[PDB]
Amino acid sequence: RVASGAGLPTSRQTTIMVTKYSEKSPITIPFELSAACLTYLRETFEGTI
């Protein structure tokens, strides 16, 4: 605030204290796994090449 001594008025409130709320915006994405790929991933049958 700047100030003058004229008849026009000045404000006294200094350091206004406001609160701000957040807005939510979630994001999703699926990814798929076939059961054949999962069974060949885990259970190694140790056989051959």
């Binding site: 001594g5 004229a6 008849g7 026009l8 008025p9």
Partner: protein
């Protein structure tokens, strides 16, 4: 909101600010009640206009607000609106002697006689004219006396009215002399006399049949000086059967309120009441 600043288009010399610094805690009215004002509405000289009516100024200065001048340091005069109740110190320039009990009411400055008419600040078109602070009996006497000038002088020539008001304009209250210069017959005077006529007719009609004959019974019974005054005032045009207590109670209530609405034209609510007067009769410490 409490302190009111002002300014001039002139600058202020040491002679002028020395005239002005003597007027600390002097009363100055304001027509507007705003934070920053100009000096062309300060005081009363915006509103003075001769051959218009002293009674118009009496009804107009009654309507302005009041302030107290202090702390002058250069283009700042700092009028300060008094709060309702605290003890303040004032200063009067209207030459009337004061008393610790007598309250105060504001009047426009009538001319006093010496053709001084002191204005104490003279600029190019605006002088500073100041409101008078006067005690309550002189204010009541002024209001009743100019109402006498208004009400008495209808339908008369200038000659007997001149001979009457040449001795009726003088009020000799506390070794002074006074004059009421412009009692001119305005619409304001006509509505004041119309309310006075209505209130007088109401108290003449709805008063009792026993209050009209009270002074007649004191004339037949007693003898004093003011009784002889009443006989000379009323005698020129000259067992209680009816008794009624509660009708007399309501009758006196109606008589009281109509007397009050007659009395309102001269009795202003007080604006100051002192606690001490300075013994040289300059300042006083009053509560409002």
């Amino acid at each position: 909101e409490a302190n009111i600043f002002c300014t001039f288009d002139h600058k202020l010399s040491i002679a002028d600010v020395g005239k002005l610094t003597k007027l600390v805690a002097a009363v100055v009215p304001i027509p507007q009640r705003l934070h920053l004002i100009k000096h062309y509405q300060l005081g009363l000289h915006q509103f003075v206009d001769h051959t218009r009516g002293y009674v118009r100024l009496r009804g107009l200065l009654r309507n302005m607000t009041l302030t107290l001048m202090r702390r002058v340091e250069g283009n700042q005069i700092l009028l300060h609106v008094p709060t309702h109740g605290l003890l303040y110190t004032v200063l009067n320039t209207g030459p009337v002697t004061w008393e610790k009990g007598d309250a105060l009411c504001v009047l426009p400055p009538l001319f006093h006689g010496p053709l001084a008419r002191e204005n104490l600040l003279t600029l190019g078109q605006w002088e500073l004219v100041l409101p008078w602070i006067v005690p309550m009996p002189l204010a009541l006497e002024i209001n009743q006396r100019l109402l006498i000038m208004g009400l008495f002088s209808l339908d008369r020539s200038y000659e007997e009215v001149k001979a009457a008001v040449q001795q009726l304009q003088t009020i000799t209250f506390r070794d002074a002399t006074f004059t009421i210069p412009d009692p001119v017959i305005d619409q304001h005077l006509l509505i004041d006399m119309k309310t006075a006529c209505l209130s007088m007719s109401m108290v003449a009609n709805l008063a009792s049949e026993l209050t009209m004959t009270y002074v007649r019974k004191l004339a037949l019974e007693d003898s004093s000086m003011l009784l002889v005054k009443c006989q000379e005032l009323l005698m020129r045009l000259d067992r209680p059967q009816h008794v009624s207590p509660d009708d007399e109670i309501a009758r006196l209530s109606a008589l009281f309120v109509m007397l009050r609405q007659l009395d309102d034209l001269i009795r202003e609510q007080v604006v100051f009441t002192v606690c001490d007067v300075s013994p040289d009769n300059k300042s006083a410490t009053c509560i409002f």
